[PDB]
Amino acid sequence: IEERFEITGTMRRLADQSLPPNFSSLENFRAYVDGFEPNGYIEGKLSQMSKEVNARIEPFLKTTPRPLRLPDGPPCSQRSKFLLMDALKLSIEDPSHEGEGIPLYDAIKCMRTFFGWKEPNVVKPHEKGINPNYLLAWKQVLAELQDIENEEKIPKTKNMKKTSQLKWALGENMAPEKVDFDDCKDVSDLKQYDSDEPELRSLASWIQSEFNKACELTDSSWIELDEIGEDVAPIEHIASMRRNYFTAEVSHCRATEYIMKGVYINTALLNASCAAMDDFQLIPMISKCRTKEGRRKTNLYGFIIKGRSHLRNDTDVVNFVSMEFSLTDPRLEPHKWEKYCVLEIGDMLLRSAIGQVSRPMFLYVRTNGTSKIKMKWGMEMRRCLLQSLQQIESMIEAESSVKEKDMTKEFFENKSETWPIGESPKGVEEGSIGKVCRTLLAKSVFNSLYASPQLEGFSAESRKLLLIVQALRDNLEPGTFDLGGLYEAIEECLINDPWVLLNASWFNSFLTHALR
Amino acid sequence: MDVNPTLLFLKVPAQNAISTTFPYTGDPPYSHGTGTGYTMDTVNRTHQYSEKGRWTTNTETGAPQLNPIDGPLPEDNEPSGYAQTDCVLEAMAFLEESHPGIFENSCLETMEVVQQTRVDKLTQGRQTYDWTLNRNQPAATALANTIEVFRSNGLTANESGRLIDFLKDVMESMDKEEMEITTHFKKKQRLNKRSYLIRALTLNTMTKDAERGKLKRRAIATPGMQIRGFVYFVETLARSICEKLEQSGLPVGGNEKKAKLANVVRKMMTNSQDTELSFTITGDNTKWNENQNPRMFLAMITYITRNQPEWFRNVLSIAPIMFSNKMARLGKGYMFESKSMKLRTQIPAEMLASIDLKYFNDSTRKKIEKIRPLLIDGTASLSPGMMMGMFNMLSTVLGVSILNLGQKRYTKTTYWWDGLQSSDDFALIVNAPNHEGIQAGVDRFYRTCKLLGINMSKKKSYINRTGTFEFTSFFYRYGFVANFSMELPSFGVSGINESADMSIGVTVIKNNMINNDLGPATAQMALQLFIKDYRYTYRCHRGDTQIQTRRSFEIKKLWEQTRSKAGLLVSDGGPNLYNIRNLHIPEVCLKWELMDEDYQGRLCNPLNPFVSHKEIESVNNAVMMPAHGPAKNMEYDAVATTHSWIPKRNRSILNTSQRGILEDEQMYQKCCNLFEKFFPSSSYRRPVGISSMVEAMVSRARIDARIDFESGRIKKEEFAEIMKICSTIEELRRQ
Amino acid sequence: QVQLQESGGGLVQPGGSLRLSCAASYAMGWYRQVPGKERELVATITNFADSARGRFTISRGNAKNTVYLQMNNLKPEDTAVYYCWSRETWGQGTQVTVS
Amino acid sequence: MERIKELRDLMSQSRTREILTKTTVDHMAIIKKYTSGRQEKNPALRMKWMMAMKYPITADKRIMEMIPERNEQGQTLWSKTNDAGSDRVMVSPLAVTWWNRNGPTTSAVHYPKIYKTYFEKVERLKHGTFGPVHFRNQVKIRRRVDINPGHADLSAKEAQDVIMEVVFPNEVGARILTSESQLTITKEKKEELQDCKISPLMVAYMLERELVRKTRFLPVAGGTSSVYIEVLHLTQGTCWEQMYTPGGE
RNA sequence: AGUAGAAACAAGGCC
RNA sequence: GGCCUGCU
């Protein structure tokens, strides 16, 4: 038998219309191809082609790269789902573990530990919402917390009443009703969804200080790691010792506290959204630490009210309202709290040598939102620990490949070697390996917190320029074909995100300090 | 003092700490709404990069098509799709000369495969655009629907069970006056010749999500089922060809890519003497897919298949012939909002041809105005170039031809170049006695690339001295450096099931320790964090804790019931015995000797109602879409336990007019289960033949009853009962 | 890329003084090697080892591209080849002999 | 008896009768994969989202007659509402743990005989002897190596006939294995697994894994042996080497 | 309002 | 008010 695959009919005519411009049939084109032999045709067209088609190499020197321009506009605002630098903790000193316990009872017990409650009043308005709604929501939360305190056994999860206050605060019945085009065509206002470049905003100095204090040590251990199989190999012992060193370095770090806060908050929010889709739910922000003395402790930052969460797509938004205690007066950096409503709820007395301070104690209240993807990715914030400590362990291994011996202990104790991890007005400041660990952990945590497309684009297009600059510093005669194009590609990612703008400022500082 | 991590690069080289520059710990960007805008923008951009071509109107589809081939040579560095037929034919000829026997051999193996390939091979594919319903559906479903429609219309050659016969039927369908399709809202609708042609030549456009590394979103395309067989054969030929080319890196993995990159850099630099300078270009190609004309792929394949049986040439040429006339569906549509009346609306994309432009903004208004002339029956003709890397391997072949065209035998000059090409990305090592020689070599390479419709992205490319470069997120600095930030997203619970997730997590940790140079202490930390997240996700806590969950009661009673609690699986609330030495052992086997026999038997019980196995392909294979790469499959070691359940399905089909698909699913699955019970090898080896179900089932009932009496439980009473029941079903099938 | 040349060594009295200087082509410093031993940390730029603290001062002129080591009240135990470095890059060392 | 009886019951109803009559054997695979269920793009997100629901997993109908509808306190274990496109019913994860504390028990003595590869790995590691860790730069060079340490010198297709004749002796067809190595393998794995009742498909899959040779490209430094490659993560690192000798040697 | 960012969510459909 | 769905 002979296999027959014949092109005929319409499919043949299509073959006659898929040839070069000056061919009439597939038969003729195939005959030409079979009869074709190389006779120096690339050279002829290369000679005839215009010489303006070139890839001239522009030398890259120390004076070539210019600082990246940052956008100008109103200062950048806060985007986090919870307070990071201005958080306050009410504690009970209980022996329970992280997941162990019941949320509502722990929150009520922690809140009863504080005395000095005052009738709440407006301090700094939202500037775009209805602050009285926030005030009434706070008082409602307090009242219903007492209502739970009265009854027999604290419920594991509580549902709140759907008053107009939280109906507005949670954005209920505000989605436009879906209709058919044939019924709405004469409406003049009918147009596309607003699709334009985000608003431009200039960097502010608050994000820098927030990152600075996100890398600082603390008086608690915010990581209680799980169990592993007992180490049997010497390499396993080395790994365990290294891991213990890093845990001692990073556990007492605000980055770990932020990691735990985000993980717990997002886990609770996702579980409540998946379970109580319809009805508004109360969730106290809880985080459990261990003191220097070793006594376990619980901490209550505030409360989250989750709203209707009928989330179908990964981008669908669940709205909630977050309330958090703090002592930082919002009258000093108002531009950082554009979307917050801040009340005055009490006074706190912390033991200090200056008599006793008797500071005010405010409540930051805001309406925020998330999505299934955002919740899932925020509940995997513990991989920031991985990223950071993998980088540090790569450093240690690379250095130990030079000296034939493990170099961890002297790195962590002697602290002789230091890396540039920041710049002071005096100059570049270097810190021990532990400070590098904390700095990288904070960088990863902020990447996970302020994640956005701007961050990805800037990261890629700035890694390109970083590689070029590294090649320059290595004396490898780097060259570029269109550096202005790369600069324009980098500068289009900087729009309004505080984190990416801070990264761009850091990159400019690195260029200024480099190229010398 | 202000902390600044970037300053760390002043002491640690950039590549030794490049992992810090990968923000892969946050949510990747996602698209929210329609992808119609991106589709229209891509169509217009592809058509305007070839504006100087010549216009024609297809006599079959009636759509306007633009042919830029052999068009005017470019006079600027902007992207251009004006590829020259003679130049590319000469490049392929030189490729053949440098590698004699490549095309003939590759065609021989491809001919073998094509003439022995089966239809079922088309089911092994992800979403495909079913034209019977004008929507994306699983490959198997679309194939079944198309086969049903063909059989209803009279095209039954595919009953031979051969993919070549299926393609013969597909082509024969092109010459039919009137086909018939089914729609549910069942209604039988008639499609004329032109409508069916456009439905078979069209592509479905969507928006790509979870794409890290760029601020703007892109659009991707999915073809139909009529054209996927030709694409399969063409890609088989291209893969067989590239496997014989060491300059290609597309048909290999990552480690092979690194090995070939190291080999080529060492070859180029080492052979270079002290007088010759060497430079590496880390090049990316701008608008790679939009500038590759299918007609040029037709030319390349017809040159490859010279002196071959004409049927082979025809079957391999059908694919580019259809791509040259390919159409693209605009997309989902556009959603409008009216705040004055507080409402929203969703207009399908098919109305873009006639809908007024008052609702659209300036950018979208202009895009629609520019794309309207190409709109034919709600879809836009996209002849000039490929949409999204459907011919990856042929593009790699063209790039490898360009790379080989500078072997110093065709350059005819002191300078020369080599390197590695993987579609849309390349590393080019060019050597020349002086900087002028390097400049001339790179200029000529760029010029030759522009003669083949390939453009080099000057903004994303840079040249330095050899020894430092990048290639597909692999940073080479006197040796490849591990990143570990590309695999970070794969350190969580995969989402298959409990046992599968555990095994996949431990295996991923192991692999990233082997390949991506993950440290021991870091690996231990990853194991701890993964175990924590696993327990918190599946509500399976240690059991000795007081963490109240929806599953903490049964777990606690199982804990208190067990005597040797060290053998309990983490899924059942037991301790974790994993460590760096135990990352290559399944959990069940690591705890086998510690389990109590009662719990061991209850766990690994074949009669459990949870374990379900469908086919040999889906036993222990998990499809994990890696970050910054195409979808990939992994073999994970796991023991079939009661924890190997499969999760719930979507269940939203119940509210759609396509609700009868579930009844058909149930009936097909019942019949398949009956056949499997009749033919146990149905899953492991897919049955072949031309008979129908009931014939085989009844006849095997005859024989098995017979022989199982000749020794077994059956009795004469039962054997005769089965024989006459077989006769009963026979007469039932008669009527 | 970085080359380093030390100057200012020689024969000196005990209780004498000596100014080492290292010209370069980054943090800098000074290490020393006695005939019977490997490397000993002296100074880095500031930090000084126990055996030389208060006696010796490290300084640098970034405009001259030079790092200096001002040694005072020298002991016979300071007798070593003093090597300058940059950070991977090491000088050839300058002989200091105290007696 | 039963099998032909549900066959007749299926043929009783017109739609299934038509499906059985017009559908040919070759199309078996197609219709078996015919489904409306799309393959998940983000499995982790939905696994973390579905497990927060009640009745998130699926199980055969038989579960309704082995496990009670509710446990001691009344937490529901299974529901009678079937899945989307199957006769299986959606059930809660507790029904898993319940099955592991009061479900039927069997004799799992033969699982070690089936899952030969994994238990051989465990035995090899249990008797291994570690050594000192030496810190020095390792020149990892990339090489093609065989990962499976129990491959019987057979390819996929070469051992597929052996596997069928071991598990499905009647569907072998024309093939009768010529090589005597295959003869002995068939004899051994036939007499060893003569009454094992795990599943034909899993038995075939594990026999394929054990006998079929598989190869992959990996960065290695030393070793190169099959037994030394499975522990390549534990013996070789970036700057450290851990001497190891599996229990086999 | 809010989330978010080149288009969307701020429940959908069926009676 | 009653009931259905949450990648179709």
Numbering used by the authors:
A (entry chain A): 201 to 716
B (entry chain B): 1 to 185, 207 to 756
C (entry chain F): 1 to 25, 32 to 51, 57 to 98, 106 to 117
D (entry chain C): 1 to 249
What does the paper say about this structure?
Central to the replication cycle of influenza viruses is the viral RNA-dependent RNA polymerase which transcribes and replicates the viral RNA genome. The influenza virus RNA-dependent RNA polymerase is a heterotrimeric multifunctional machine composed of polymerase basic 1 (PB1), polymerase basic 2 (PB2) and polymerase acidic (PA) subunits, that catalyzes both primer-independent replication (vRNA to complementary RNA (cRNA) and cRNA to vRNA synthesis) and primer-dependent transcription (vRNA to mRNA synthesis) in the nucleus of infected cells. PB1 houses the polymerase active site, whereas PB2 and PA contain, respectively, cap-binding and endonuclease domains required for transcription initiation by cap-snatching. High-resolution structures of the complete viral polymerase from a number of human, avian and bat influenza A viruses, as well as influenza B, C, and D viruses have been determined. These structures have revealed that the polymerase is a highly flexible macromolecule that can assume a variety of distinct conformations, enabling the polymerase to perform both transcription and replication that require different initiation and termination mechanisms.
Using cryo-EM we determined the structure of 17 polymerase-nanobody complexes at resolutions between 4.5 and 6.7 Å; this is sufficient resolution to accurately position each nanobody bound to the polymerase heterotrimer. Three nanobodies (Nb8189, Nb8190, Nb8201) bind at an interface formed by PA residues 615–630 and PB1 residues 10–15 (site 4b). Interestingly, we observe different potencies for nanobodies that bind at similar locations, for example Nb8189 and Nb8190 which bind the same site on the C-terminal domain of PA; this is likely due to differences in the affinities of each nanobody for a given site. In addition to the core of the polymerase which was resolved in all structures, the PA endonuclease was resolved in the majority of structures (excluding Nb8189, Nb8190, Nb8192, Nb8196, Nb8202), while the C-terminal domains of PB2 remained unresolved in all structures.
